[PDB]
Structure formats: C-alpha cells, structure tokens
Amino acid sequence: GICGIMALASAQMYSSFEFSCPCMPEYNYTYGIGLLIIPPIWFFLLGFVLNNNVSVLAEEWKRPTGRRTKDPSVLRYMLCSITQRSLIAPAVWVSVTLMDGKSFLCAFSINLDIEKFGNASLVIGMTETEKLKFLARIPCKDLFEDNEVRVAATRYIKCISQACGWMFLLMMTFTAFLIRAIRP
Amino acid sequence: GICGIMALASAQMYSSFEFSCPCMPEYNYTYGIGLLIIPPIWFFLLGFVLNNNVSVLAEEWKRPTGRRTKDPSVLRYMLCSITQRSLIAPAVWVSVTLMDGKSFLCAFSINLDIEKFGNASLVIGMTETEKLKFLARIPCKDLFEDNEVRVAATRYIKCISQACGWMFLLMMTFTAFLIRAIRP
Amino acid sequence: GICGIMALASAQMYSSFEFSCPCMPEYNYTYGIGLLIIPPIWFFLLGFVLNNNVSVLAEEWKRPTGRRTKDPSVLRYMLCSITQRSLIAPAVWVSVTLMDGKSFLCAFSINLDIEKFGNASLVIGMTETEKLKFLARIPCKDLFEDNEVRVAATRYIKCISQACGWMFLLMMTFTAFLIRAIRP
Amino acid sequence: GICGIMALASAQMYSSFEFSCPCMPEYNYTYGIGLLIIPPIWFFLLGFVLNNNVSVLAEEWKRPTGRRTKDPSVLRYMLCSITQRSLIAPAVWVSVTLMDGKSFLCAFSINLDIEKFGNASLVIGMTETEKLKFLARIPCKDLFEDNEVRVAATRYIKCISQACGWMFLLMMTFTAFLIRAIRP
Amino acid sequence: GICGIMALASAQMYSSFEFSCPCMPEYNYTYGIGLLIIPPIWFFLLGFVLNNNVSVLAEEWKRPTGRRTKDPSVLRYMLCSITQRSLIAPAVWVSVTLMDGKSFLCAFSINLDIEKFGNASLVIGMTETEKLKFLARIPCKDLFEDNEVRVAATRYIKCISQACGWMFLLMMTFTAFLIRAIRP
Amino acid sequence: GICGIMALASAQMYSSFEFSCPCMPEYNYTYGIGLLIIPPIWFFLLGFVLNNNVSVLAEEWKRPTGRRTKDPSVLRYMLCSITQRSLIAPAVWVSVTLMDGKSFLCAFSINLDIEKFGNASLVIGMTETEKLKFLARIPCKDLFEDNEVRVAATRYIKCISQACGWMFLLMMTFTAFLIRAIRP
Amino acid sequence: GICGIMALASAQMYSSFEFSCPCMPEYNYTYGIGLLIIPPIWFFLLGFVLNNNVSVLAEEWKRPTGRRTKDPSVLRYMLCSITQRSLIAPAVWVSVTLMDGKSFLCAFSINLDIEKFGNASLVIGMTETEKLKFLARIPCKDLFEDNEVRVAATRYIKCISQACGWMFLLMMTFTAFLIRAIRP
Amino acid sequence: GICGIMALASAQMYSSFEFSCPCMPEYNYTYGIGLLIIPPIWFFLLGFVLNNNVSVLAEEWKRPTGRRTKDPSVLRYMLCSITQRSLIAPAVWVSVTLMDGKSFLCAFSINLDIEKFGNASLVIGMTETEKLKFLARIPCKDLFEDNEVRVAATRYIKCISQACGWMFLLMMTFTAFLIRAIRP
Questions:
Q1: Pair E40, E90: CB distance under 8 Å
Q2: What is the spatial distance between Cα B164 and Cα B178, in angstroms, rounded to a whole number?
Q3: Are B166 and B59 spatial neighbours (Cβ–Cβ below 8 Å)?
Q4: Nearest one of E166, E175, E156, E153 to D34, comparing CA atoms
Q5: Burial A140-164, CB ≥16 within 10 A → b, else e
C-alpha cells in the first residue's frame, strides 16, 4: 500500500524537482552526490515514520528485560522486514537519478579529460584554477560556450550513469532474489 | 483528513502565488523572509481554527479550577497533539519555498560577492548605495542587464536554498521520528 | 455548503473578470478601490439573500412585541452567526484581489515618486496636470512608453499589496480564532 | 432547476455569441442597446414558455367569473412568483454584457470627446458627418487607424460599463433582499 | 427526447458544415438562401420520419370512412402536435445560421452599395457585369483584394443578419407563447 | 444497434481516410467516382454480413419447395427490411462525401471552363492533351501554380457538390417517408 | 472478444509503427512487400496461440486412431472456424497498409516511368544503376531533390494502393458473404 | 495479471527511457548491445522476484531428499511454466527496441561502408582511428555534419533492425506455438 505510494511519490518528486547545478568546483561534488545520498536517507526515515508499526517497535525497545512479552526473534524479523519494505522508495530515487545522469554530470564534470571530445585549443595556456572553473560549467547549458564539447561530455557521463543505473538495478534485484529464496 | 487537505492546499497555494520580488534593497529582506515566515504562521493558525476541537480546548481553558471535569494531563496531550498535527502545512510551505529558492534569491541577493560569477568590471567605481541598488535587481529577470551573472547568481543561491531545503526536511523528519518513538 | 460554494465562486469570478483600469487620474481611485469594496458588499448581500434563513429572521423582525415566540437572545445569536458565515466570500475576494495587486496598482499609481525607479529625466519640465496624466498610465501595459519604469513600479505596488494581503489574512484568521475561542 | 439552467445558458449563449458591431453611426446605437434589451426580453418570454405552469395560469385567465375555482389571491401570487423566477436569466445577460462593455463601446462611441485620449490633431478640419464616421469605428479593431486612442477609448467605456454593471448588480440584489424580507 | 437530440444535432451539423460560398453572381442567391431553406425542410421531414408515431397517422389516413376507430378530432390534434414538436430543429438551424450571418453575406452581397464602406475609386469605370463579379467575391476572404471594404461589408450584413436572427427568435417565442396559452 | 454503429463508422472512416487524388486525367474520374460508389457497396455488403439474420435467409433460400416452413411473404418482407436497414451507412457515406466535395473536385475538374474563374491567358496556345493535364491538377494544392483559379474552381465544384448533397438527402428522406407511410 | 481486440491491436500497432523505407534498390522490394506479408503471418499465428482452443486441437491431433473420442467432422469444422476467426487481424493490417500506400510507395518506386510526372531532363544521360538509385529515394522525403516529382509519384502509387485496398476489401467481404451463406 | 502488467511496464519504461548513445567507438558496442541484453535480464529476474510462487520453489529446493512432499515432476513443470510466463516482458523489450532501431544504430554504426550512402570525399585521406571516430557519431543528430549521409545510414540500420525485429517475433511466436501444441 504505502510502499507503492512512496515508490510513485519518489519518482514524482524527482520529476517536479528542478535540478539547479551550481556549476562551481567547490560545490559541484557536494550538490551532485548529495542529491543522490540525502533524498534516499529522507525517504528511508519516511519509511520508518509513516509506517505506524514503528510504535510497537518503540514500546518493545524502551522497556527493559523481563517486561518483554514477545521474544526478540520476531523483533529482529520485523525490524528487518520493515527495512526491506522501506528500501523501495530510496531505490526508486537512485534508479531514476542515475537513469537521467544529471547528478553524475554535475558531480563528475571536473574529472573529465577535455581532449577526447572537441577542440584541443580550449584549455591551452590555462591554469588549473581557471581550468576547473571552465570544466565545472558543463552541466549549465546557458553558461558554456562550446556546444559540441558540451553535448559530447553530457552524452559520455549520461551513458556511464545509465550503465551504473542498470548495474545498480541488477545488484538490487539479485539481492532481493536471494532474500526471498533463503529467508522466508 | 484536513491535515492532508491543508498539506495539498499549501503546495497548491504556492503554485498559484505569483512571486513579485520588489528588487529594492530596503524591501528585499522583509519580503523574501516574510514570505517564508508569515504564510507558515497563517497556516498554523488555520490548523487551530479549522480544527473544531479547539472549542473543547476553549471551554476547558476558560473555566477556573474546580469546574474542570478532565484532568489537565489529557489537556496537555491534546494541545500538543493538535500542534504536531497542524505543523504539516507550515512545513510543506517551507519545504517547497526552499526547494524553489525564490525567497533566498530575493532576500540574500544583497549579500553576494560579485567577483565570483562574471565580469569584474561591473561594480568598479560604484558607491555602496548604487552597488546595493545594482545587486538587488538580480531576482528580477527583466531589470538586470548582465544575463550571465544573473544565471550564475541564481544557481548559487538556488542550490544553497535546496541544501537548506533538504537539511530542513531531514531535521523535521528526524524530530518526528523521535516523537513517535518515545511519546506514545 | 453554500459557504464553500460562494468562496469558490468569488475566486472564480475574479479569475474570469477582466480588469480594465481606466488609466485616467479622475477615475483611477474610484475604480481601483471600488473593485475592492463594491464586490465584497455584493457578496455580503448575496450571503443574506441566498441563505433562506433570512426569512425566519424577517418574520421575527416584522412582528411587534408580544407576538415574538422566540426570545431575542437566539435572534442576536443567529443574525451574528449568519454574518460570520457570509463573511467568507467577501474575505476571499479581498484576499485574491490584494494578492494580485491590480487594484493597488490602479488606485495608487498617482501617489508614486518616480525618482526611485528609472530615469530622472522623465518628469522634468512637466506640470502637475500632465505629470498626473503620465503617472496614471502605469497599469496600462500598452499605454506606457518606459517599460523599465513600468515593471519597477508594478513590482513595488504588487509587493506592498501582497504585504497588505497577508496582513489582512492574519488579522482575519486571528479574529476568527478569538471568535471560536470565547463565544461558543 | 430550469432557473439555474437558463442562468447558465444565458452566460453560455453570450460566450458563443460573436459580437459584430456595425461601426456605422446610424446603426451603432440600435445594435448596441438592442443587444442589451432584446435578448433579455427573449429570455423573459422563455421563462414563461419553458415553465409549464403558465398553462394553469392560462386556464384560470381565460374562463370568466363564476367558473374560477381558485381565488385570484393565489393567482396574483403565482404570476408574481413566476416573474421573479424568470428574472434571473435576463439579469445574468445584462450582468455579463455590462461586465464586458462591448455594447457600451458599440453604442456610446459616438458620444466621446476625443481630446481626452490621444492626439488633438485627429479631428481638426473635419465635418460632423465625417467626425461621426471616424468615431464610430472605435469598437472595430481592424478599421481604426490610431491604436493608442482606441485602447484609451475602449478602457474608458469599459470601466464605465463595469461601474454600471456593479451598480446594476447591487440594485438587483438589494431589491431581491427587500422582496424576501417583506413578502413571504 | 428526440426533440432535444435533433435540436442539438442541428446546431452540431451547422458547426461541422464548411460554408463554401461560390462567389459567383448566378449562384450566390440560390446557395445562400438555399442553405437557409433546404436544411430546415430536411430537418422537418426528419421530424416526421424519426418519430414512429407517423405510422399510426398513416394507418388512420389510408383507411376510408367507416373503418376509422378514432374520431378525426384527436387526429387533427396529434398531427398539429407533431408539427410543433418537429419545428424545433428547423428553428434552431435558422437561428444559428442568422446569428453567424454567412448566408446573408453570401446571398445579399450583390445588393450592396459600395460607396458607404471604403474607397469610392473601386467601381469607377466598370460595367454592371464586372461590378456584379466584383461585389460577389466579398464573402470569399482569399478572393477579395480590398480588405477594409471586406470587413466593413461583412460587419454590415452580419449585424443585419443578427437583427433578423433576434426578430425571428422573438416572433417564434411569442408564437409558441400564444400556442401554449389558448390551445391546451 | 449495429445500424447506428455502422452509420457512425462510415462517418468516422471517411474522417480518417486520406483523400489522395491522382491529378492525372486518365485516373481522376475512376478514382473520384469510385470512392463515391465502391465504399457504399462495401458498406452494403457489410450490412448483410454483420447482420447474422442473413443465415436464416440463407437456409430458407437453399432448400427447395416443399421443405419451406415459412411462406415466402415474410421472406420478401425480411429481405426488404434488411435492405432498408443496411441502406443507412451507404447513405451516410454519400452524404459526407458530397458535403465535402473532394470527389466532385477530383472527378469533374477536367470538365471545367477556365475562362470563368481567373486569367484568360492560362490555356492560350495549349493543346487539348496539355490542357487536360493542366486542369487535372486542380485538386492537388501543391501541384497547381495559380492559386486564385484553384480557390475559385474549388468553391464552384464544392457548392455544386453540396447542392447535390442536399438534393440527395431530400430525395432519400422523402423516399423513407413514403416507405414508412404506406408499407407497414 | 479477442477477435475485436486483435483487430483493434492491428490497426493500433500500424499507427505506432514508424515506417522507415531504406530507399535502396536492393532492399526496397523486400522491405515494402515484407511489411505487407510478414506482420499478417505473425497476426495469424497470434490468432492460433492466444486462442486456448488450439490445445484441444493439439490433443486430438497427437493421439492416433482409436483413441479419438470426437469424430474428425467437428475437428475439420473447428479448425476451419478458428482460421476464419483469426483471419480478421491479418485482414485489418493489409487493409490499413494498402489504404496508406506506404508499402506500395516503398516497393514499387523502382518500376515507375519518370516522364509522366515532372521534368524530362531528370534522368537524361544516366545509367540504369544510377537511375535505380535515383528512383528509389522517392519515399524518402528528405533524400529526394525534386519535390514536384515526389508528390506526383506519391499520389500515383497511393491512389493505386487505395484502389487495391478497396478491391481487397470487396473480395474479402464477398468471400465472407459466401461463407456465411452456404456453410452454416 | 502481473504478466500483462510487466509487458505494459516494459513498453512504457522504454518510452520514458532517454536513449543517450555515447558516440564513441570504445563504448558504442557495449552500450548499444547492453541495452538490448541487460534490461531483459532485469525483467527476467523481476519475473522471478515479483511472482511470490518462487518461495514455494525455494522451500522445495533447499530441503534435501526425503523431506520432499511433492515429487520433482511438478517441480520441473512449475519452474518451466514460471520461466515461460516471465519471458514476456523481456520479449516485449527486445521487440520494441528492435522496432525503433536505436540500439542497432548505436552499436553497428562503426561497421558501415560509407561509400553506399553519400559523398565519397568524406573519409578520403583519413586514418582508421579518425574514421572510427567519424562513423561513431552517426546516431548523434547534433554531432554529425553531413545530414544526408546521416539519414541514409539511419534508414539502413533501422530497416535491418526492423527486419530482425519481425524475424524475432516470428521465431518467438512459432516457438510458443510448438510449446502449446505438444507440452500441455
């Protein structure tokens, strides 16, 4: 119920989210990786909070030994089962974020090698500080002057991000395959 | 019921609201921060007023001691529970307002350092009064002459506002996590 | 029932209303303030007329003393309660009219000080009659020649109108908060 | 039932009606005032015809004295009540027609004073016949040469028509207020 | 039932009908008046044919005197009542056709006086045959060279057609008013 | 049931059909008249095939005399009644095809007289073979060079096709009027 | 049920199919005729596979003589009846494919005679290999240089394909007419 | 149920997927073939995971011999039946991916022979490394300079991919035809 609702909400919240990459070398990595990390953590704690069966977990965690009516075997089972139920909306966020490649373009555009894409006369005679300030404006469509380099560098990091998007989806599905094959 | 209605109404009222930043240095801060503060206060008092269970709170607050049929333990519990039920539509407003970054762009565009973004020849030979009147027109798209500086300064304060939007959402969710883990 | 219908009708009638500011100094104030005053009075008398419980008020007001089956205590209560039920659609009109700022732009564009916005060479060597005829055409987009002054003066009176729109909404909600806290 | 249907039909028939002002001085007044008068008369006789309770009025009007089973007190009451029920769709027509101001622009554009709006060199050296033929083409957007005079004269008669539209709505609502306060 | 269906079908069939005026003086009058006359005759015979109560009229008309089980008083009543029920979809066609004025523009554009609208130098030195071939192309937007004369002549015959459209609607409604006031 | 379905299907299949007139004099007549004749024949045999009451007609036609349980009076009645039920979707096709006039424009554009429409200098000094190849490209919008002649010739054959469309609808309705007045 | 579903699916799958004619003389015929032949064969085997009554056909075909509970008379009847039920979605595909004429344009544009359409100076002094490579690019809108020849050759093969589309529909309907007139 | 859901989800996930071919010769083949191979493997393991009848397969696979309540004949039958039920959403992906031809264009554009399409003067005097870097940018619309070669090479590999798309659909349907003809 709420698992399918939060999975649809995670894809819908990414669609309405307006990605504003700062295009500065100090704040590209923390913004690009931070939108890959911090909204999954919020969707994970939303999976604890919106599920009202954390309250029964709370009452059987707060009371000391002797008062525990249920054995902790079903407690370990339920806390595990509520984690792998609340691990869908984080995984849907990291799926669609890696499929679009906006965060890999924002975070990893200062690690590129510019000789592979377009003119070799771009960065000639330019210091590492100004070269980092030149490479960082690649995700900004209206701040980069060379359009052919910008489409070449966008397609390179978007295909790598889509490769990591499918390798993440295969590792997640194969993990849930092993979970529903040995544990219940 | 009305909590989900007011949460959807707060996001819908922001979408129909037309943000008109004054682009004057005397009235940028009060308008930009005021749209972050004053509509949450109105949505908080709307959470008291539209909930008709403030009337039973009113009758057990007006009558003096001796006439009180209920002990004030359930009174403290209910006034607390109606506050954390009416703290959703304010929090949805501050969420979407910080996600768009229009108020942080309107209020904090007189605190910028203009050397980081574009031409260094912009503010040379210009007094602090005219420099404040030059920096204040950054949120106004049709009043600013340098477009590359305007997109650079917009993206800088929009990513900082989105960082504060996610840090607010994490602090709010972790607070409600502790509330539903110790109190009921 | 009809309170929510008239509240939605007041917002919908403003959306279909085509604001035609006359852009003349004799008729700006009466048209701009008159659209803020006269449609709330019509929506207030519509709250009396469409509510068929004004007929029972009519019969117990027309008959003299002695024939009055009900005591006037419930009569004062019901006439008060029908006023604060019919004070929603007027308040929704003044809310959305102040949020858009078209009436404050139409009525108060002859009180502006033109040195704050754009060129100081606009009104130089111009008589008070022609200066009033120059300032009055600010709300008319297709009658004003200086576009930068027009957007600056529009944003100034629209933010002031939105400030008065939120101060009206706070004073109205805090008043209805006190009404539902002492009276019933 | 049919009162709300005819009220919605009167607003919908005005929206689909294509206003073709003749822009001739002989036929502006009769067309502009005639669309304000003649469609309310048709909607009034439609309120008699579509209401099948005119047939019982017909049978108790045709038979002479002695055969009248009902006293004429309920006959005066019912003929009055069917008039104030069939006076809604005429009033909705005159409301929306005065709110748009197309008929006041078509009928009263030969009464204007052209010095108030634009160039004083328009009508200089021009006979009353050609001046009437020049002023009459104001509602025709594609027949008038001076666009600034045309928008100024349109906004002047549209705000006056909207003033008469609200004064008509206030006089109609206050009349129906007195009707439902003394008569039943 | 089928009366409201045929009334909506007559307005819908006019909306999907593509008016192709021939713009020739031999065939303007027969096409323009013929679309005002011939589709009402087809909708009138459709009111006889689709109403299956013409079959009982057929059986009591074919059998001679002596075999007639019903007296012809109800036969005159029913044939009259089926005519005034099948006189709605013809009247809706002539209503919307006169409201748009395309047939009056097509049929009566050879009767115009061209001095009233635009340049007097249009028809100077031109024979009655070529003048009829010049006036006939007024309804054709892409065959007439003088656009100001074309909009002036269109608005003249469209307002006259809308005057005859409202005088037809008043004469039809007042006739049906007298029918439902004396006959049943 | 299926009569109204096939009538709506015939109008819908014409709307989705893309009329590609060949614009060659050998194949204009057979294509233009063939789309008026051959799809009505297919819709007529579809009226036999989709109606499953052709099977009972088949069994009482195949068996010789003596085995016929029903007299052939109801057989003549039913085969006639299934023809005039399956004569609606052919008639709807010929109605909408003559209302649009594309087939009369495609088939009869080699019979025109070109002096009536535009320049007399078009076909001067041109052989009957090249004149037939010049007149045949009138329905092709992107193959004809003279646009004023093309709109004049299109409007001439479209009004004649709409005249034959209404004369067909009157002859069909008057025929079905006589059928439902004498036969049942 | 599934017959009407597969018929609607065949028309819908053609509408979403993007026709990419190769415009090479070696692969025009096999692609153009192959899209007319191979998708009907797939829709025919889909009519066997999706119909689960092929399994009962499978069990009474695999078992040898003696074990056959049903006589093969109903087996011949059912295998025939399932073929003429699964011959609808192939026939709908060949219908809409011949109505659009894209396959006849792709497959038969190397058989054309180019003197009939446009300039005779196109193929003069050109070898059969380059003439086949010139004629093959007729279905490709963005690979053919002469647009008037391309629209003339498109309209010629599209009208011939629509002629074969209607002759196929007449031969198919007349065949199904004979089937439902002699066999059941 | 979930088979038709996953089949519609596979076609819908391809429609929302944004194909970003890297247009580099090292990473064209692995990206183009990898999007044909890796998403079918994920949809195949999704057919195991979302079907909860893998848990009963898990319990009867983990327990050793002696504890097996069911014989492994129904185990081989069910594991086979769940594979041919979960082989629909992979097959729908490879169907629509080969129908669009984007992966065959991305993976096989370094194997082309450029003399067949356009100018022979393109690759003259160019090394195999730069020729591979020139041919690889064919799927990139905004990175290839010769548009006529790009449309010719796109149509060549899209028709070959559509040929392999129909040969895959015929081999898959004929295989499922043999499965439902011998096995159950």
A1: yes
A2: 21
A3: no
A4: E166
A5: beebbebeebbbbbbbbbbbbbbbe
Of the candidates H156, H97, H116, H117, the one whose C-alpha atom is nearest the C-alpha of residue G31 is: H156
- D102 burial (CB, 10 Å; 0-12 / 13-18 / 19+) is buried
Give the integer Cα–Cα distance in Å for G176 and G84: 9
Name the one residue in this structure whose structure tokens are 């910008």: A150
Contact C119, C91 (CB under 8 A): no
Report the residue of chain E nearest F118, measured CA to CA. E143
Query: Which residues lie closer than 8 Å to B54 by C-beta, 6 or more apart?
Result: B48, B82, C180, C181
For chain H, what's the residue count? 184
3-state secondary structure of B99: helix
The answer for A 23-82 residues in CB contact with H (under 8 A) is none
E32 token code pair: 């323009």
Q: How many CB atoms lie within 10 A of CB E146?
A: 16
- Tell me the two tokens of residue C32: 């701009």
Name every residue whose Cβ is closer than 8 Å to that of residue C50 and which is 6 or more positions away in sequence: C2, C6
Using CB atoms, list chains with 3+ pairs below 8 Å to chain B.
A, C
Q: Do chains H and G touch (3 or more CB pairs under 8 A)?
A: yes
Other CB atoms within a 10 A radius of the CB of residue A74 amount to 11
**Tokens, residue E92:** 């809706």
In sign, the C-alpha dihedral spanning D55, D61, D63, D65 is positive
| C-alpha–C-alpha distance, residues A93 and C102, integer Å | 42
Looking at the partner chain, which of G151, G156, G176 has a beta carbon nearest the beta carbon of F49? G176
Q: What is the resolution of this structure in A?
A: 3.4
Please tell me the total number of residues recorded for chain B in this structure.
Answer: 184
Cα diameter, chain D: 76
Residue with tokens 């052709």: F54
Coil/strand/helix, residue C149: helix
Cα–Cα distance, B35 to B41 (Å, whole number): 10
Residue A68's contacts (CB-CB under 8 Å, 6 or more residues apart) are A60
Contacts of E34 in chain F (CB under 8 A): 163, 166
Question: How far away is chain E from the Cα of F56, in angstroms, using its nearest Cα?
Answer: 27
